[PDB]
Structure 1
């Protein structure tokens, strides 16, 4: 079977992160069999030593000599640590000299929670491990590849990272999906800069068979575990959606509404004539859709769900004592029966298996073999190769640019609304949006949330008339956007429409260095992490907070490109646009599937090419009016027109101005 492989990559040096097991371990193995000298990097020394010994033994069997010189290991390497990545590159260059192939394979599953239950630090950790690490290693190795006149960067993405003009929603995995999309977008935008010397591509396998305790989660894996979590999350979502909806139209505070749940009795809540209709209807559903042997059919929640529900409420700025659930009656085991858990387990498994046109799961070996043959192709760059595929799954096309205003019925919903606008750099866009909502569509007030005092003063001077009239309020957020939103909620009330623009402009630094330069001026590893903080994490933090705070709609706005933006700014803007589409699509589907009201969509001020941009003041006026129209199209709330069909249309989409 190895006949076709031996000699294919003779003379090459390859660095494989996550190289002791899974797909990475097989790519390392097969590259070594093909003749490459390999460095395997991962955290655990023992697993690396086992893999190294297995590969060296196989190399000796096929005839290689001095096998200790062909397979090296780099233990204690966690790709989320910049210092560990710097050490890995020094160790690899010391062992083998210049790296020919950088195989950016290591990937972690991430937080595995809905955005509204996702810690911000958890999101950041996934980006550091899965995405920022890929830029970091490219930044350290590409100078030597360019100098020698050849190199290859391969980012191991996922089918769930999407494709060129479409996002793929991956509910409960937004951090992961964004990291995967970012890996592909990095190949797409850097290819022109890295060429002709260096190829950069991504692989996007679908689910791959492997160790049930490991992997990034595309494969079925652990069933009873995945199922029980799904059932616990479903109970949390149903309770949270009913309490949020009840609070919106009931005179009682969230504290008073949560007090209705304290007897923890489903039948008593359904039968309570004074309980809000959303809670009584929910209790009816728990009794009907429930297994009579499961205590979840007679009890509303348990201590674990209650704590996670309380965390959502506190994070949404609702006021409740921390000990509100201290005396909650504990429901008897089983909360969910074995039958319920096994039914959900079969649903998870069959769902994944049912996507496959070929009705067979590829192996890690199969995926690695297709990848190692693909590496021999010298005529591809900026591509995403699918070593496995043939999947039936939902897709969200991105980049539509032909649109108009929403219906007068949708625009009528804006009268007397509380609008939040977030931004700093885009003063023209912010001024025009505040004026459109206040002057044209009768919003009651606009809360302008900026980053700095200088930004606040600039907006206050631009909107002096609305400031004086008490229609425009300004808040300075700094790096504490969630606390700034809590200030807005307490002082000015909860938002209806929200528009989120980035605080910062894109940097103007080179993306590659000259062949004989030290690359000292090129976008640094720290600067790439800052780009992700300002252009991706910013939107995630706002979306998480606004959804938790019962915002009606949210428009995520990407950076602006113009006819005079630098070529590097166009590349970075397109990297952000593609990567954020993964977030928008995923959170849109999460929201829709969990009966959350919020409509979340993306409005792009970034275009693929300079030639598409306005060239004169007339075309610029047309562009700014298109921006206002795009934002109103995604922020005007659906009138009580609110169907399942209309609901799916108005969430997780991206439109280009």
Structure 2
């Protein structure tokens, strides 16, 4: 079976991260059998030593000599740590000299929560492990590749990272999806810079063959949380009771008593009815509203949304008797998950790690591909959200009427003209009651206060300085000015103008640093994640995520980084749109792109510029004007969530 493989990569040196198991271990194995010298990096020394032994034993069996010189390991390697990645590269270059192939395979599942349950530090950790690590190793190894005149960077992404012009929603996995999309986007935008000496591609395997009760149980506990949270948020909107008083109705922990209470809000009585109808009579979840675990995670959502409740509100919650969910409900949801994955597959057969690695090692022999995403497995039935539509007009007069009397939050700093035009559109054209302008710095606040002096003097434009504490700034806005209806989130920072690759004979000293690439992710991805999380938790009606602006005079490097961010953020927008849709959250989340693919598409004169700024206002109004609630059908609801439009 190895006959077609032996000799294919003879003389090559490969670094494989995550090389102790999974597809990474198999790529390491087959590259070694193909004749490459390999460094396998991973955390667990013991698993790495076993993999190294098996590969060395197989090389000896097919007739390699000095097998200890052909397979090295780098144990205790956590790719989320920049220091550990520098140590990995020093260890690899000491062992083998210049790396030919960087196989950026290492990956973690990430937080595995909905965005509104996702710790900000957990999201950042996923980006460090899964995405920033891929740039960091490229930044250290590409200079040596360019100097020797050849190299290959392969980022191991996923089908769930999307594809060119299409995002793939991955609910409960936004951190992972964005990381996977960023791995592909890095190949798409760096290929022109790294050519002609270096190839950069991604692989995006689908599901591969590699507890299921415990996951099905978490799905059911998550559904109970979502149903309770959505009804409490909906009730609080139109009831005179505070959220504290609404949550008190839950404390007897009695479904039938909540359903039958004529003074309970309709959203809570209808929910109680659903718990009885859809419930298993042998499950305590059919007669009790929640348990302490769901209660704690619900209280965290409410607290994270600026709702005022005492920390001990659930201290005396009656404990429902086991089972909360029956083995029958848990097993039915587990079959639904499993059957869901198997029904994705056109070929009705799960690919093996071995088969994917084999297709990958054949693919690495191709010298005429860069910027591409290879699907070593595929044929998948799954939802996709096309991105990059440019032909739109205004929303309906019915949706625009819903802006009258509204509280608008605008977030930004660098895009002062956009922010001014938006504030004035919402206030002067569409009868918003007030705009809260949330900027990064006092200097930004003063720039906006001078641009909007008339509305400031009239009490219609309030300014808040967020710095690096956007969630506390939004809490200040909720407390002082009221919860937001429409929200527009622009980036505080412009894109950097440093080189993305170095001259062949240079040290690359000025080239985008590992720390600068992290900062890019912080300012252009994490910023929107933090706002989306906080705004959804705080019951905002709508949220436009706005990418950085490219113009006819942007540097080629700014175009590359802009498109990196635009592609990567599409994964976020698509995922959180579907997560929100499927959990009955009102909020509409969509993306408005100020980034284009090519300078030739940008406005060239003042007239075309005016056209562009009018399209920007139109685009933001198209995604932020709320749906009159009768129009939020299943059909219209899916259209107005998780989409991106290009100005």
TM-score, normalised relative to structure 1 = 0.98
Counterpart Cα distance in 2 of 1:235 and 1:592? 16
- Cα shift at 1:535: 0.1
SS state at 2:76 partner: coil
Counterpart Cα distance in 1 of 2:214 and 2:544? 35
Correspondence for 1:153: 153
- Cα shift at 1:503: 0.1
1:223-242 equivalences under 5 Å are: 223-242=212-231
CA deviation profile, 1:69-119 (whole Å, cap 9, x unmatched): 000000010000000000000000000000000000000000000000000
SS state at 1:102 partner: strand
Counterpart Cα distance in 1 of 2:412 and 2:84? 35
Correspondence for 1:283: 272
Correspondence for 1:215: none
Correspondence for 2:100: 100
SS state at 1:272 partner: coil
Pick from 647, 651, 654 the counterpart of residue 637 of structure 2: 647
CA deviation profile, 1:109-156 (whole Å, cap 9, x unmatched): 000000000000000000000000000000000000000000000000
Counterpart Cα distance in 1 of 2:21 and 2:246? 50
Counterpart Cα distance in 1 of 2:12 and 2:384? 38
Correspondence for 1:216: none
SS state at 2:463 partner: strand
- Cα shift at 1:226: 1.4
CA deviation profile, 1:233-266 (whole Å, cap 9, x unmatched): 0000000000000000000000000000000000
- Cα shift at 1:556: 0.1
SS state at 1:153 partner: strand
Counterpart Cα distance in 2 of 1:355 and 1:553? 32
Counterpart Cα distance in 2 of 1:482 and 1:514? 42
CA deviation profile, 1:335-357 (whole Å, cap 9, x unmatched): 00000000000000000000000
- Cα shift at 1:225: 1.4
Counterpart Cα distance in 1 of 2:208 and 2:519? 33
CA deviation profile, 1:305-341 (whole Å, cap 9, x unmatched): 0000000000000000000000000000000000000
Counterpart Cα distance in 2 of 1:510 and 1:560? 19
- Cα shift at 1:468: 0.2
Spell out structure 1 runs of 4+ moving beyond 3 A.
none
SS state at 1:521 partner: coil
Counterpart Cα distance in 2 of 1:315 and 1:471? 27
Counterpart Cα distance in 2 of 1:337 and 1:269? 22
Counterpart Cα distance in 2 of 1:227 and 1:235? 13
- Cα shift at 1:490: 0.2
- Cα shift at 1:303: 0.1
Counterpart Cα distance in 1 of 2:160 and 2:411? 29
CA deviation profile, 1:474-519 (whole Å, cap 9, x unmatched): 0000000000000000000000000000000000000000000000
1:122-141 equivalences under 5 Å are: 122-141=122-141
Pick from 306, 312, 315 the counterpart of residue 295 of structure 2: 306
1:455 equivalent in alignment to 2:444: yes
Counterpart Cα distance in 2 of 1:339 and 1:510? 59
- Cα shift at 1:160: 0.1
SS state at 1:420 partner: strand
Counterpart Cα distance in 1 of 2:217 and 2:45? 33
Counterpart Cα distance in 2 of 1:441 and 1:181? 37
Counterpart Cα distance in 2 of 1:24 and 1:420? 45
Counterpart Cα distance in 1 of 2:525 and 2:181? 12
SS state at 2:409 partner: strand
Identify the range of structure 1 (639-648 vs 366-375) with the bigger mean alpha-carbon deviation: 639-648
1:590 equivalent in alignment to 2:587: no
Counterpart Cα distance in 2 of 1:399 and 1:648? 17
CA deviation profile, 1:607-628 (whole Å, cap 9, x unmatched): 0000000000000000000000
Pick from 248, 257, 264 the counterpart of residue 268 of structure 1: 257
Counterpart Cα distance in 1 of 2:165 and 2:432? 35
Counterpart Cα distance in 2 of 1:604 and 1:642? 24
Counterpart Cα distance in 2 of 1:521 and 1:457? 33
Counterpart Cα distance in 1 of 2:164 and 2:431? 40
- Cα shift at 1:229: 0.4
- Cα shift at 1:529: 0.1
Counterpart Cα distance in 2 of 1:41 and 1:617? 54
CA deviation profile, 1:179-199 (whole Å, cap 9, x unmatched): 000000000000000000000
Counterpart Cα distance in 1 of 2:129 and 2:638? 32
SS state at 2:540 partner: coil
SS state at 2:324 partner: coil
- Cα shift at 1:652: 0.1
- Cα shift at 1:528: 0.0
SS state at 2:530 partner: helix
Aligned residues between the structures: 645
- Cα shift at 1:276: 0.1
CA deviation profile, 1:159-195 (whole Å, cap 9, x unmatched): 0000001000000000000000000000000000000
SS state at 1:639 partner: coil
SS state at 1:169 partner: coil
CA deviation profile, 1:545-588 (whole Å, cap 9, x unmatched): 00000000000000000000000000000000000000000000
SS state at 1:199 partner: strand
- Cα shift at 1:285: 0.4
SS state at 2:393 partner: coil
CA deviation profile, 1:35-74 (whole Å, cap 9, x unmatched): 0000000001111100000000000000000000000000
Tell me the C-alpha RMSD between the 2 structures.
0.3
TM-score, normalised relative to structure 2 = 1.00
Correspondence for 1:9: 9
- Cα shift at 1:642: 1.7
Counterpart Cα distance in 1 of 2:636 and 2:138? 44
SS state at 1:229 partner: helix
Provide structure 2 residue ranges, at least 5 long, that are not aligned to the other structure.
Answer: none
SS state at 1:235 partner: helix
Provide structure 1 residue ranges, at least 5 long, that are not aligned to the other structure.
Answer: 211-222
SS state at 1:474 partner: strand
Correspondence for 1:361: 350
- Cα shift at 1:31: 0.1
CA deviation profile, 1:508-541 (whole Å, cap 9, x unmatched): 0000000000000000000000000000000000
SS state at 1:283 partner: helix
Correspondence for 1:64: 64
Counterpart Cα distance in 2 of 1:317 and 1:353? 41
Counterpart Cα distance in 2 of 1:580 and 1:44? 33
- Cα shift at 1:457: 0.2
Correspondence for 2:461: 472
